[PDB]
Amino acid sequence: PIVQNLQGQMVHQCISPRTLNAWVKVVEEKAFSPEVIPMFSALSCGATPQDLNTMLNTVGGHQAAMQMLKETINEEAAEWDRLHPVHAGPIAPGQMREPRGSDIAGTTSTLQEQIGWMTHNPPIPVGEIYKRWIILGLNKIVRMYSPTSILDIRQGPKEPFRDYVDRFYKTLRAEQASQEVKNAATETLLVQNANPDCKTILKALGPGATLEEMMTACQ
Amino acid sequence: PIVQNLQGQMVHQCISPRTLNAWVKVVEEKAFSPEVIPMFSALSCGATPQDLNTMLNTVGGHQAAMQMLKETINEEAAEWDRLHPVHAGPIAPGQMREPRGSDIAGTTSTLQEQIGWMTHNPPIPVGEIYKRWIILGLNKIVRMYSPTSILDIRQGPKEPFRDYVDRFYKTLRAEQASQEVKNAATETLLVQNANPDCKTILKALGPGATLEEMMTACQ
Amino acid sequence: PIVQNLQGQMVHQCISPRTLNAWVKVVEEKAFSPEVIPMFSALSCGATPQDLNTMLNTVGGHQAAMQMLKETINEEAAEWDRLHPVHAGPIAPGQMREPRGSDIAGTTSTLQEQIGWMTHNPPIPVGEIYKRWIILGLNKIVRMYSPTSILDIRQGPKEPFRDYVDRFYKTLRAEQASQEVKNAATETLLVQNANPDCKTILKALGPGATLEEMMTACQGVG
Amino acid sequence: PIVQNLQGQMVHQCISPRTLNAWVKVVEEKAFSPEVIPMFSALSCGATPQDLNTMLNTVGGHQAAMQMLKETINEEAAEWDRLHPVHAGPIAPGQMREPRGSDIAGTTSTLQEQIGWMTHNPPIPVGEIYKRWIILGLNKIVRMYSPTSILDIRQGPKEPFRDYVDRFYKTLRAEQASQEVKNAATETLLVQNANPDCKTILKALGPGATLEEMMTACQGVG
Amino acid sequence: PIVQNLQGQMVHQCISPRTLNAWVKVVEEKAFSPEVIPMFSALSCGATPQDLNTMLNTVGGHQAAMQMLKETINEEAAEWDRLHPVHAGPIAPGQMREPRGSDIAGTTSTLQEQIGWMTHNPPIPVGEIYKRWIILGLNKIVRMYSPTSILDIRQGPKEPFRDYVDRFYKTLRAEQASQEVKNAATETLLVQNANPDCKTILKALGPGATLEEMMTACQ
Amino acid sequence: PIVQNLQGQMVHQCISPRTLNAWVKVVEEKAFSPEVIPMFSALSCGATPQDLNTMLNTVGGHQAAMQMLKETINEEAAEWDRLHPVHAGPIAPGQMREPRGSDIAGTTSTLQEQIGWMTHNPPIPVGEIYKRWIILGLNKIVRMYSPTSILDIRQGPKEPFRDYVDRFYKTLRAEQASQEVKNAATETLLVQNANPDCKTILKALGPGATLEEMMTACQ
Amino acid sequence: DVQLQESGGGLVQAGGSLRLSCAASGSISRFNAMGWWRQAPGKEREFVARIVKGFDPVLADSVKGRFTISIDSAENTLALQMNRLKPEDTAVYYCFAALDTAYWGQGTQVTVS
Amino acid sequence: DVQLQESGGGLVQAGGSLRLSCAASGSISRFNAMGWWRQAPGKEREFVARIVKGFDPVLADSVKGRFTISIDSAENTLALQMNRLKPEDTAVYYCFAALDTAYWGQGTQVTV
């Protein structure tokens, strides 16, 4: 990645063995549960495009998802080239070339070129752009791998309300990778899919309900 | 988080893999036991608002509590905006804008804006303010997840006094952490809920007995 | 904590994840066995009052001991205020206020104030003073939680002499007492509470036997 | 490796215990599965030729692969000498000698010479070149050790479609081939080698179905 | 401990959590096997007297040995005072006092005093002196805890010569903590305590034998 | 070991707890398999003679091998003294003395003397020289502990050729590590010790076959 | 198990519009994919429309401009609104739904001229 | 079983060309290695050419400038094209294929 050193200057640093193992392990243990998207973003702090490709390439399993991710990246690269086409011409001594979609994805760029763009003034943040594309791809995968549709999450008769609600928002989180209205379905389906004795209690609560007040009522 | 370098200058540093894993792990092992709130505060030392959101978002389970936390943060953001409204106007070259409630929570602010506020002279500590709101929210969750009311902690006939006192103060701690308020109730119910023979010993000890004196007396 | 930096200046550093986890684990594994007190002192090297409170607050169990510990701290805080009362007055621009007992314990002071006292010239070491009170409190807890009196430590019939002697001085450590007591007690109870096969050997060694000589002599009983 | 230091100067640093242990373990756990090649490249960031040889030499098993790897390196070393022959002559005081194929592979060069080439202006990156040869060699080994041909990858009757597709593209990765081959092969064998319950569903989806749509469609078969 | 920082100056550093745990664990797992003396010396690199006492005090078991160690330290302190008595007088502004036996052992000295002596020019290395005394004490303990006298190590009929020789020098190592002649007993007892079929082979080897040549012969 | 600081100056640094534990652990798990010699060399990067003795002394078992190693070191020390005898005389203020064989092995030299030689201009690398002797000694031990002669590695009738070749070169490696010498024997015995049907295939392949071609042929 | 039945089909003249509807047993949100295929007498089955859960509707190219496929979870029905009908549209139209393998309706005959 | 039979050998003048071909049953892609050896009366069996699956063809040095080896998977044949034939090249030529065990043809006589 690119970090600030003890002097003000920004220098490249080797990807650490600790970070690489952490990413490989969280995928092995948690797969594509929604919380993996945060973890990737934190583990890829300051990453060059090469580093991001390294993290993704070190994943051994889940090769269907990885192939799907490549499709999303390629889709995003084409839109980059369409909105920011490369101005062609001979390059002036000591000036950098313009990054293409494939340069941002680390396929046609060198580490030194990636460092050049990221540390320029003004900076061309090829690392941050690529990370955005990867996260868009991962969101789709998390959603595909959501095991249950929200409509099928219904409280068991012996299930504590807290455990049903935990399951409910986890499923909601997996669909559309959170980042949605999160309000229309809640005011509706959470009560309808509640258990029968609890449903009567939730119905009786009236308009306006905090999550906190309803869970206390059903304790 | 924000740390100082050898020059003393305040610079951003990526959140470490050790801290992230530690937080995810402590939540997995301890859930929302009262003791987790200390740990969060220490693990989030120097954190930017981005980092605090990262730590909370990497938690996979307990999504009901997380949704309650979002509600509490949003409530605190509105009061921040009401008590410190944003002054509108064109931004002067080299001047920074005023943070809104949503800027403190890291939802509508960039890392660079967050760093600008935290490193200003005088500093506008958006990280410390957001951490206050999160801890207020976590406190509410520990209370909700307290499994027993202190009134239901009664010393068993064969239970050693030391083991009973441990159970008593664990429950008291969950009920929105220790305070001086927890002491008026303590000098009363701990004795009333003691077993027959020990209660006689504690009553005979008289008023103002220290825990050391009472625990020694009932040994 | 407060650390040296690369230049001479004393700067604050966040408590590390390694230390916090280490402290929580030693309490889980060893509870309040006497050896935990040295570990606490080493893990809290350079700690601010805030850091010390974090370490104590992250302990989940043993809340009887923790509440008892709070009582001891408050007693020591009151004595601090009595021997070093706070001089009242308007504060001069750029001068520090005087720390009260409660400021040393980190209850009414901010991190910046704590750093200010510790980095003054001359330094007012509010962190080191608080650690003294905490260690005083932990000493009382280890003694209360010692499970056996030495009077009840007697060598088992098949117990190796080394293991009985190990148990003997471990109990003495929790009981702490003094060095005079530790040497009077050995000259007494260690021989009488020994097993009869070892007792005959120890008696035959005569007066003035070193601890070293008895343990070598008794390596045959098994 | 060669690292940036706190000042701008490039200095040598010992290979770390964390990296060495990590490399030995990935080989023990994953052998020569295709994902090991990226890990090697990341763990060997900035490596000198000496460091790369240490990493390869610490592997205890798989000595057939290691000996095969040595053969590939020697082939690449000979080609280096042919395209970049060494200019012979007396060496001028303070000038570097020219690296041969065998110097790049770390067999006949000293650490100081390796550091000299890598830190020259312009730099002669003997470390990066050698890593290229090693990765070329590892690619051949992963292909040889691929246990199953795609032609033999067929969906099991109770196998979830995701798992068959996972197996399909894992095999393609070891087989490496090309992107044209990977897209021609999918349009062919993935449907025919699917289970019959899934095959009916995939056939009913029609032409132009995305990989994403088929995996969603087939989530019912279980 | 006292270490060199990035500038030439020698500064104090907190004992690390990694070192403390390592010392506690090696004692728990290996007890007083002879190789523990090396490990202690390496883990106590640069240690102040306080740090050395910390390492010894964090040991929970083996309190018989620890009490024996205290006796040896006290014995060494008296000899220090006898050969280097303290010159008495009023202390000159900015001059250090002279260390006594008890100051070297960290019982009557402050951390600042210990640092003062160790970083003086010329340095008074109170840390190194105390470490020597501790190692003398540990050597006696290792010897006491040697489970077998060398005279009783004899090769079994089915024991590979290599395994007997491994046992032989381990026992020899425990007695007198190595650091002995290591030659008179070897030219003698190793052959006599060998197994009968091997003894004939070893006897037949003649004068002069390398350890290597004898083990090959008996392979 | 000796490392450079930010000034570039060569300074001593304590051996780390991670390296010491790693060495003890690798010996426990791998014993004296040939692959341990690489690991030792990497773990002892920059080591002083004191550090190398520390690493070897912390090994608890295998004391026969350690005693053989001491013999080999002592043999190499005598040849060092014979080829580089010490010039006798009074030492000139600010001049250092000449290292003897025993000074290189760290037995009669102090750390300060060791640092002086290693950091001189020109440097006298007592650490690298001692490491040479130790590795020479370890090489002899791996050969002694090789369990099988290469002549006894014969392909089983049902053994896959790949698994047989792995066994073949493991044995060859133990026999004083890989070399060019190990290649004259390889082109011969690997074929002669192959199973019937594969031998016919390898013979038909002709001279100069690469391992890749032979291993493919017998698959 | 799972039953599908198309309906709403028949014979209409050119330039007209028509809406076919496919009734499904159970809840339609349980299916992971549904769509419409057709076969004309003597001609091989041609693909018309597909809707996969979470994805946009996909239509065949010969119909892309003219047909629309929709799902009404309230009535548990799958609609194909055939519009701007042509003579090549004479065919039998089938709906399919896939849950643990696919299922077909009996078809509805559509004849345009 | 795997069966091979060579043909096309004979007596030719110097400088001519010839293509020996070894027909194999089944598909040649199933074999893990194939090649050509020759033995003349009184001469020891000598290695001529080898093709291993996925690898480039290797030829002996005594034939390297003049002979070429190719494989036509269409005709299921192993071809050795030999130009500039010399009298010292006179020998019987054998093909081999490696599956499970090693299989050999019966050979074809070449006389220059």
Side-chain angles (χ1 to χ4, degrees), chain B residues 4 6 18 29-30 35 38-39 42-43 45 162 165-166 169-170 173 178 183 210-212 215-216, chain C residues 6-7 12 14-15 18 20 24-25 28 57-60 62-64 67-68 71-72 140 144-145:
Chain B
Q4 46 268 309
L6 72 83
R18 211 168 313 165
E29 292 162 19
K30 301 297 196 77
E35 72 210 87
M39 189 63 75
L43 290 174
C45 183
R162 187 192 306 177
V165 178
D166 280 313
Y169 284 139
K170 176 72 162 282
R173 190 152 111 184
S178 289
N183 289 101
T210 313
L211 254 54
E212 330 185 22
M215 292 225 306
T216 302
Chain C
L6 309 171
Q7 315 194 6
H12 179 82
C14 297
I15 188 163
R18 233 155 185 83
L20 290 160
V24 163
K25 294 315 174 183
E28 283 179 355
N57 285 6
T58 55
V59 179
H62 305 291
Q63 291 300 293
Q67 194 84 30
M68 200 191 341
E71 288 191 337
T72 297
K140 291 183 169 174
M144 308 268 164
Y145 288 11

Side-chain angles (χ1 to χ4, degrees), chain D residues 24-96:
Chain D
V24 163
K25 294 315 174 183
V26 302
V27 174
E28 283 179 355
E29 293 161 21
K30 300 194 158 192
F32 296 98
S33 297
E35 71 272 20
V36 166
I37 304 185
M39 187 80 73
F40 176 76
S41 173
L43 290 174
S44 62
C45 185
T48 63
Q50 190 189 57
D51 293 331
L52 295 163
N53 287 328
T54 52
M55 291 174 75
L56 298 180
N57 285 6
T58 55
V59 179
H62 305 291
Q63 291 300 293
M66 303 307 303
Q67 194 84 30
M68 200 191 341
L69 183 53
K70 293 296 178 182
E71 288 191 337
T72 297
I73 290 168
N74 290 340
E75 152 174 338
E76 294 297 321
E79 183 61 346
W80 177 268
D81 291 342
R82 159 184 177 263
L83 297 169
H84 305 93
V86 176
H87 288 183
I91 195 58
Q95 299 303 297
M96 293 184 318

